[PDB]
Design a protein around this motif. Sequence first.
Motif, PDB file in Angstrom:
ATOM      1  N   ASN A 169      -4.808   2.208   3.843  1.00  0.00           N
ATOM      2  CA  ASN A 169      -4.405   3.471   3.315  1.00  0.00           C
ATOM      3  C   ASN A 169      -5.504   4.368   2.821  1.00  0.00           C
ATOM      4  O   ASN A 169      -5.434   5.552   2.880  1.00  0.00           O
ATOM      5  CB  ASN A 169      -3.668   3.033   2.094  1.00  0.00           C
ATOM      6  CG  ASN A 169      -2.450   3.644   1.963  1.00  0.00           C
ATOM      7  OD1 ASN A 169      -1.904   4.093   2.874  1.00  0.00           O
ATOM      8  ND2 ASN A 169      -1.974   3.675   0.815  1.00  0.00           N
TER       9      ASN A 169
ATOM     10  N   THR B  34      -1.432   7.135  11.356  1.00  0.00           N
ATOM     11  CA  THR B  34      -2.149   7.071  10.094  1.00  0.00           C
ATOM     12  C   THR B  34      -2.107   8.429   9.462  1.00  0.00           C
ATOM     13  O   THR B  34      -1.829   8.562   8.275  1.00  0.00           O
ATOM     14  CB  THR B  34      -3.589   6.716  10.286  1.00  0.00           C
ATOM     15  OG1 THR B  34      -3.673   5.489  11.000  1.00  0.00           O
ATOM     16  CG2 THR B  34      -4.258   6.548   8.971  1.00  0.00           C
TER      17      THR B  34
ATOM     18  N   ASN C  25      -8.339  10.709   4.909  1.00  0.00           N
ATOM     19  CA  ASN C  25      -7.255  11.232   5.696  1.00  0.00           C
ATOM     20  C   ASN C  25      -5.934  10.557   5.279  1.00  0.00           C
ATOM     21  O   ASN C  25      -5.881   9.342   5.018  1.00  0.00           O
ATOM     22  CB  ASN C  25      -7.518  10.946   7.179  1.00  0.00           C
ATOM     23  CG  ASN C  25      -6.614  11.757   8.092  1.00  0.00           C
ATOM     24  OD1 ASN C  25      -6.436  12.952   7.889  1.00  0.00           O
ATOM     25  ND2 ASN C  25      -6.070  11.129   9.112  1.00  0.00           N
TER      26      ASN C  25
ATOM     27  N   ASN D 197       0.844  -1.168   0.000  1.00  0.00           N
ATOM     28  CA  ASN D 197       0.000   0.000   0.000  1.00  0.00           C
ATOM     29  C   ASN D 197       0.896   1.241   0.000  1.00  0.00           C
ATOM     30  O   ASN D 197       0.441   2.372   0.112  1.00  0.00           O
ATOM     31  CB  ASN D 197      -0.911  -0.028   1.198  1.00  0.00           C
ATOM     32  CG  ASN D 197      -0.158   0.121   2.480  1.00  0.00           C
ATOM     33  OD1 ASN D 197       1.016   0.472   2.481  1.00  0.00           O
ATOM     34  ND2 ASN D 197      -0.825  -0.117   3.577  1.00  0.00           N
ATOM     35  N   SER D 198       2.192   1.000  -0.106  1.00  0.00           N
ATOM     36  CA  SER D 198       3.142   2.063  -0.354  1.00  0.00           C
ATOM     37  C   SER D 198       3.555   1.761  -1.780  1.00  0.00           C
ATOM     38  O   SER D 198       3.947   0.631  -2.083  1.00  0.00           O
ATOM     39  CB  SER D 198       4.346   1.903   0.525  1.00  0.00           C
ATOM     40  OG  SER D 198       5.418   2.651   0.022  1.00  0.00           O
ATOM     41  N   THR D 199       3.458   2.744  -2.662  1.00  0.00           N
ATOM     42  CA  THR D 199       3.810   2.528  -4.059  1.00  0.00           C
ATOM     43  C   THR D 199       5.265   2.135  -4.229  1.00  0.00           C
ATOM     44  O   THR D 199       5.593   1.291  -5.053  1.00  0.00           O
ATOM     45  CB  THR D 199       3.510   3.750  -4.882  1.00  0.00           C
ATOM     46  OG1 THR D 199       2.126   4.070  -4.720  1.00  0.00           O
ATOM     47  CG2 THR D 199       3.771   3.479  -6.345  1.00  0.00           C
ATOM     48  N   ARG D 200       6.133   2.738  -3.440  1.00  0.00           N
ATOM     49  CA  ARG D 200       7.538   2.426  -3.486  1.00  0.00           C
ATOM     50  C   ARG D 200       7.810   1.032  -2.929  1.00  0.00           C
ATOM     51  O   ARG D 200       8.718   0.325  -3.388  1.00  0.00           O
ATOM     52  CB  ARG D 200       8.301   3.422  -2.664  1.00  0.00           C
ATOM     53  CG  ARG D 200       9.783   3.142  -2.665  1.00  0.00           C
ATOM     54  CD  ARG D 200      10.499   4.071  -1.739  1.00  0.00           C
ATOM     55  NE  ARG D 200      10.044   3.835  -0.382  1.00  0.00           N
ATOM     56  CZ  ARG D 200      10.239   4.679   0.618  1.00  0.00           C
ATOM     57  NH1 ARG D 200      10.880   5.821   0.415  1.00  0.00           N
ATOM     58  NH2 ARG D 200       9.783   4.380   1.823  1.00  0.00           N
TER      59      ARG D 200
ATOM     60  N   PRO E 241      -3.995  -0.816  -2.535  1.00  0.00           N
ATOM     61  CA  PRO E 241      -3.464  -0.324  -1.267  1.00  0.00           C
ATOM     62  C   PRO E 241      -4.464  -0.422  -0.106  1.00  0.00           C
ATOM     63  O   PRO E 241      -5.446   0.333  -0.048  1.00  0.00           O
ATOM     64  CB  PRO E 241      -3.127   1.131  -1.577  1.00  0.00           C
ATOM     65  CG  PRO E 241      -2.756   1.105  -3.007  1.00  0.00           C
ATOM     66  CD  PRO E 241      -3.749   0.147  -3.618  1.00  0.00           C
TER      67      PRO E 241
ATOM     68  N   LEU F 244       2.789   8.583  -2.928  1.00  0.00           N
ATOM     69  CA  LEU F 244       1.879   7.666  -3.575  1.00  0.00           C
ATOM     70  C   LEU F 244       1.712   6.428  -2.706  1.00  0.00           C
ATOM     71  O   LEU F 244       2.679   5.951  -2.154  1.00  0.00           O
ATOM     72  CB  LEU F 244       2.472   7.263  -4.923  1.00  0.00           C
ATOM     73  CG  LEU F 244       2.183   8.074  -6.181  1.00  0.00           C
ATOM     74  CD1 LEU F 244       2.504   7.214  -7.346  1.00  0.00           C
ATOM     75  CD2 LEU F 244       0.737   8.437  -6.282  1.00  0.00           C
ATOM     76  N   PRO F 245       0.510   5.843  -2.643  1.00  0.00           N
ATOM     77  CA  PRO F 245      -0.752   6.048  -3.341  1.00  0.00           C
ATOM     78  C   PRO F 245      -1.571   7.281  -3.009  1.00  0.00           C
ATOM     79  O   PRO F 245      -2.346   7.736  -3.852  1.00  0.00           O
ATOM     80  CB  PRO F 245      -1.513   4.800  -2.990  1.00  0.00           C
ATOM     81  CG  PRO F 245      -1.031   4.504  -1.633  1.00  0.00           C
ATOM     82  CD  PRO F 245       0.423   4.703  -1.734  1.00  0.00           C
ATOM     83  N   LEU F 246      -1.432   7.810  -1.801  1.00  0.00           N
ATOM     84  CA  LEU F 246      -2.151   9.021  -1.464  1.00  0.00           C
ATOM     85  C   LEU F 246      -1.832  10.041  -2.541  1.00  0.00           C
ATOM     86  O   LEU F 246      -0.729  10.028  -3.113  1.00  0.00           O
ATOM     87  CB  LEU F 246      -1.730   9.522  -0.098  1.00  0.00           C
ATOM     88  CG  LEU F 246      -2.718   9.313   1.056  1.00  0.00           C
ATOM     89  CD1 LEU F 246      -3.382   7.968   0.973  1.00  0.00           C
ATOM     90  CD2 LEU F 246      -2.023   9.502   2.429  1.00  0.00           C
TER      91      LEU F 246
ATOM     92  N   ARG G 115     -10.883   0.974   8.302  1.00  0.00           N
ATOM     93  CA  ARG G 115      -9.627   0.975   7.555  1.00  0.00           C
ATOM     94  C   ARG G 115      -8.974  -0.377   7.507  1.00  0.00           C
ATOM     95  O   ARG G 115      -8.316  -0.731   6.526  1.00  0.00           O
ATOM     96  CB  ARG G 115      -8.641   1.990   8.132  1.00  0.00           C
ATOM     97  CG  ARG G 115      -8.933   3.432   7.737  1.00  0.00           C
ATOM     98  CD  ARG G 115      -7.748   4.359   7.964  1.00  0.00           C
ATOM     99  NE  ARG G 115      -8.034   5.677   7.421  1.00  0.00           N
ATOM    100  CZ  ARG G 115      -7.174   6.426   6.736  1.00  0.00           C
ATOM    101  NH1 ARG G 115      -5.955   5.988   6.498  1.00  0.00           N
ATOM    102  NH2 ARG G 115      -7.546   7.610   6.268  1.00  0.00           N
TER     103      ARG G 115
ATOM    104  N   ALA H   6       2.281   4.483   6.453  1.00  0.00           N
ATOM    105  CA  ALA H   6       2.292   3.495   5.356  1.00  0.00           C
ATOM    106  C   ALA H   6       3.465   3.656   4.387  1.00  0.00           C
ATOM    107  O   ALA H   6       4.229   2.726   4.145  1.00  0.00           O
ATOM    108  CB  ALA H   6       0.980   3.554   4.595  1.00  0.00           C
ATOM    109  N   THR H   7       3.615   4.863   3.878  1.00  0.00           N
ATOM    110  CA  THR H   7       4.620   5.166   2.908  1.00  0.00           C
ATOM    111  C   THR H   7       5.947   5.596   3.477  1.00  0.00           C
ATOM    112  O   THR H   7       6.771   6.155   2.765  1.00  0.00           O
ATOM    113  CB  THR H   7       4.128   6.261   1.984  1.00  0.00           C
ATOM    114  OG1 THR H   7       3.562   7.313   2.755  1.00  0.00           O
ATOM    115  CG2 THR H   7       3.074   5.736   1.061  1.00  0.00           C
TER     116      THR H   7
END
Lengths: 292, 292
Positions: free
Chosen positions: A108, B44, B248, A80-83, A105, B268-270, B138, B49-50
């Motif tokens: 997220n 969060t 969020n 759910n993290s693109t990276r 994802p 990303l994805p956000l 979530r 996540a990222t």
Amino acid sequence: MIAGSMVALVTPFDAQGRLDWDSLAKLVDFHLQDGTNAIVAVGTTGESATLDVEEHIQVVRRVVDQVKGRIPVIAGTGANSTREAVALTEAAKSGGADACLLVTPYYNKPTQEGMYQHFRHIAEAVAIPQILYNVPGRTSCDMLPETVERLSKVPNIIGIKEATGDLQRAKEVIERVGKDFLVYSGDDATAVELMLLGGKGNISVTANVAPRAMSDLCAAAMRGDAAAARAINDRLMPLHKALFIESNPIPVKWALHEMGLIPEGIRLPLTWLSPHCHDPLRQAMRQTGVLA
Amino acid sequence: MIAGSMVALVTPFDAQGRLDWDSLAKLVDFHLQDGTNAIVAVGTTGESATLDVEEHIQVVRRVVDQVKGRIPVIAGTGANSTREAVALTEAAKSGGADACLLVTPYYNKPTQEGMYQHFRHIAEAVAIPQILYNVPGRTSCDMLPETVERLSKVPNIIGIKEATGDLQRAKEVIERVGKDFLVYSGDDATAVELMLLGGKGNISVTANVAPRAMSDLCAAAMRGDAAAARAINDRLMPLHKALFIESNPIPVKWALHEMGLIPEGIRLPLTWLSPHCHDPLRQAMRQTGVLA
């Protein structure tokens, strides 16, 4: 080109938690022999959430190594993290996998637009076929058919594993995408009807315990034997239910241990099938001929 | 001690994707001044996540450092794996965190028994207060009140962040748990009443743009001054809804950038707040006095 009975392969652990190479090999020979059209290693069923970045490629390797090009090996690679995702896909690629299964994802909550840019980024980044994965009940997000449509026009994205189990959502995704974009079932109980609608395969869980029957189901459903397909599915419904009597893959592992294919080992936060659920599932396995 | 208005802090990113330490310093300063009672770093809202593993500690440390211990620092360290949950937590404890916020396992959907075993273990492996965070909106997983009672009785588990926004639940929970266990709010909309019922704080998102009003609101509430608690909450209501006009923390990041506190930057994805939702939100910040 990747279609039909596909196994969402579990991932064996010993009572202590460590991986059991001995058992993976067998599972692979089982499905090899029995005629599964493709293996999906490190998916939700493969307990992808609790494996080392290091444990996840090792797994893919020794599966790819053993299949030895005979049937397609699909690796679960979604983050759910693109990276973190490109990282895993890059790894699966440099593992020898043939394609990747990427889940939307989780936790997220991306917007449709964010979901889109997430997946194109990955498709742009790693030269390897990629199969989308929509499963709201687990993600808490949802890839509208309108977004899958946009995505289908990207180079190395060649399908979706649609797991809502909603047959109108299917009747819609299929209607929106070209025939070279393949729609897979991610819900065993209704996978027969989705194929009758234009679906081309079922990344299945039942297939772990009854791979031969699942090929038969998938084949008949893909030719047009609607009466044959539903008759097989009807025969397997008690099992599809039982395999989800407690969150997956808790049930299917109990099953496999009972068939003596895998040890009793499942990593936290997942637990071993609670005592209540043993005879409703032992009976299903019997009532459906995989256990004597 | 841990109570009152707690900001679930956003973690800023510059246009290219990197961490803006300047801005993180500004935010801390901002809350440190306007009355915040605590800081939930890397949660969060913090867009955990990222984040990289290294990026994770590099901040929790930076904030603690900047706080001079004037205020407690709660770090997010929940994972859907029992193992990284323990790892991330070991990190926060080293970085100097005073307690941890751990989300119930997302995407893999445990058993209630599994949740219990999950958290219990983590509680015996890292000596540091822990705050359970519940949010089925979530995680596709709901930690029932029985499972909460049960865990509340584990040595260094000191509370729960309740997001369901269902007041009846956070009334059954207060009932079931001790006098020493602390129930916090997750839902900003309903926080006030959760506190009027016996809550001890609000792990707020709105507090990002309006820390001082939230401090006040929590004071009024935890005193039992419902009259005042609600007065403020109404003049914030426009805000509470606007900041989730899109997942969020996509909205709240935008607002923060609008106040000149953080740069445009989200991983990303956000994605960045869709134009769509610009008038609606900007107006609210005006109705609310955070912007003219």
